[PDB]
Structure 1
Amino acid sequence: MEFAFYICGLIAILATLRVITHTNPVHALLYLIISLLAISGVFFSLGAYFAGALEIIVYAGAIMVLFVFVVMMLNLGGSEIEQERQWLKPQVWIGPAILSAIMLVVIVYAILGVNDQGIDGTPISAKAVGITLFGPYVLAVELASMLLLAGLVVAFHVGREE
């Protein structure tokens, strides 16, 4: 339980670090596929079976398939991306990096001063999530379907060839 969680977290952080510091869109997309697999391994270590299963079903199975589809649309062969590599110049990235660094310091200082007795890792089955989803969270289900409908119709209206 501990080994899988820590290994998946380590390769997760390494993977997303390789995503944000890469120039090839397909290579970064593959790296974040690996990262999402790692987040789902973290979820399975924590006992959230439905959450990690769903991360590989749609988060690592549907949305980024559309991402690769758009990369296939554009055929990004490195035009106006790698010819300057301006995001690797230290005068560009050092400032925002120290911004996110002091933000991370503040966030982990807030996290480290809270109670904790550990996570027992008892599995939460998909039937309990289904019971709660169509129990006290029914408005969330229907209005999230409405949200998906709104995203669908706007993406249709904008993404047209004509």
Structure 2
Amino acid sequence: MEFAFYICGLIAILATLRVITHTNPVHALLYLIISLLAISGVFFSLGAYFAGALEIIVYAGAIMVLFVFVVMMLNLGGSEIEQERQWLKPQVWIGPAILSAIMLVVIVYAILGVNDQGIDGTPISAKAVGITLFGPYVLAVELASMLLLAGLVVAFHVGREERAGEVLSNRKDDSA
């Protein structure tokens, strides 16, 4: 459990850094999937068996698939932005990095001053979560369907193509 938490916790931080600093979009997504698998191990180490599985079933097996689909559809990668590698230029990342560092320091300070009896790791099952979802949190599940419906309707409205054909040519203003 302890090894799993620290090893997976470290695999995640290292992979996440590779993602934000990578030039190749697909490689960045690969390191992002690696970090999601690492976070799934952290979830399992803490006893969150349901969250654990969902981390791989929905986040690294659906949301990420959609991202790869888009990168492969628009043939992303090798763009002037990813060729200039501006993010690597120190004058571009030093400022943002310092703001993030100060935010982390302040947050960590607050965390270090909290009561900590420790996380036992007793497994919380998906059955227990389901009893809660269809018991005290019933309105959440019903309204969550409406939220996903809104995503479906909006994504279709702005994501639908006006030009028919599996292969389309990139025209300015998508002129037909």
Q: Please give the secondary structure, in 2, of the residue aligned with 1:82.
A: helix
Q: CA deviation at 1:102?
A: 0.3
Q: Please give the secondary structure, in 1, of the residue aligned with 2:84.
A: coil
Q: Please give the secondary structure, in 1, of the residue aligned with 2:39.
A: helix
Give me the whole-angstrom Cα distance separating, in 2, the residues matched to 1:109 and 1:18: 26
Kindly provide the CA deviation profile for residues 88-124 of structure 1, in whole angstroms up to 9, marking residues without a partner as x: 1110100000000000000000000010010110001
Q: Please give the secondary structure, in 2, of the residue aligned with 1:83.
A: helix
Q: CA deviation at 1:161?
A: 1.1
Runs of 4+ in 1 over 6 A off after TM superposition: none
Structure 2, gaps ≥5 residues long: 163-176
Give me the whole-angstrom Cα distance separating, in 2, the residues matched to 1:155 and 1:80: 28
2:25–2:77 contact (8 Å) kept in structure 1: no
Q: CA deviation at 1:82?
A: 2.5
Q: Please give the secondary structure, in 1, of the residue aligned with 2:77.
A: coil
Kindly provide the CA deviation profile for residues 28-73 of structure 1, in whole angstroms up to 9, marking residues without a partner as x: 0000000000000000000000001011001010001000000011
Q: Where does residue 41 of structure 1 map in the other structure?
A: 41
Structure 1, gaps ≥5 residues long: none
Q: Please give the secondary structure, in 1, of the residue aligned with 2:122.
A: coil
Q: CA deviation at 1:77?
A: 3.4
Q: TM-score, normalised by structure 1?
A: 0.98
Q: CA deviation at 1:160?
A: 1.4
Q: TM-score, normalised by structure 2?
A: 0.91
2:46–2:119 contact (8 Å) kept in structure 1: yes
Q: How does 1:92-131 map to 2 (within 5 A)?
A: 92-131=92-131
Q: CA deviation at 1:27?
A: 0.3
Q: Which has the larger radius of gyration?
A: 2
Which deviates further from its counterpart, 107-116 or 71-80? Answer: 71-80
Q: Where does residue 153 of structure 2 map in the other structure?
A: 153
Which deviates further from its counterpart, 82-91 or 102-111? Answer: 82-91
Give me the whole-angstrom Cα distance separating, in 2, the residues matched to 1:83 and 1:150: 37
Q: CA deviation at 1:79?
A: 1.5
Q: CA deviation at 1:81?
A: 2.5
Give me the whole-angstrom Cα distance separating, in 2, the residues matched to 1:131 and 1:83: 51
Q: Please give the secondary structure, in 1, of the residue aligned with 2:81.
A: coil
Q: CA deviation at 1:83?
A: 2.1
Give me the whole-angstrom Cα distance separating, in 2, the residues matched to 1:76 and 1:18: 18
Residues 1:63 and 2:67 aligned together: no
Percent identity among equivalent residues? 100
